[PDB]
Amino acid sequence: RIIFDCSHTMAAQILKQAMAMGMMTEYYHFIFTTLDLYALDLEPYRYSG
Amino acid sequence: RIIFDCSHTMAAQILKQAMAMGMMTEYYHFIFTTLDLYALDLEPYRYSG
């Protein structure tokens, strides 16, 4: 159970970090607070479930 | 514990599909069967451990 305050481009970078590290998963109940990341593209992170 | 009869480029394909689907973890203990298994892209799945 993790919560995320951070800029959205850095957040997409940490998406790349975490899905490379295998952490971008349905295992862990997350909550982002990003509202502007929709400009960037999220699709394998969204299809990671 | 799954064993993987597939080509090397097909292995890279399904690796891209699988880390897009978020199913890359140390929990999974696998065996790939392809003779070319050092000659392509190889990195982020090892950092999913």
Neighbours of B3 (CB within 10 A): 8
Please enumerate in sequence order all residues whose Cβ is within 8 A of that of A15, keeping only pairs 6 or more positions apart, or say none.
A24, A42, A45
Neighbours of A21 (CB within 10 A): 15
Please enumerate in sequence order all residues whose Cβ is within 8 A of that of A30, keeping only pairs 6 or more positions apart, or say none.
A1, A2, A3, A4
Determine how β-strand B31-32 pairs with β-strand B3-4.
parallel
Please answer whether residues B17 and B48 qualify as being in contact, where contact means their C-beta atoms are separated by less than 8 angstroms.
no
Q: Which amino acid is at B46?
A: R
Q: Tokens 């862990």 sit at which residue? A: A28
Among chain A residues, CA nearest to B43: A20
Chain B residue numbers touching A21 (CB-CB < 8 A): 47-49
Cα B46 to Cα A2: distance, rounded to the nearest angstrom: 24
The data reach a resolution, in angstroms, of 10.6
Q: Does A13 contact B at CB distance below 8 Å?
A: no
Q: Does A34 contact B at CB distance below 8 Å?
A: no
Cα A1 to Cα A28: distance, rounded to the nearest angstrom: 6
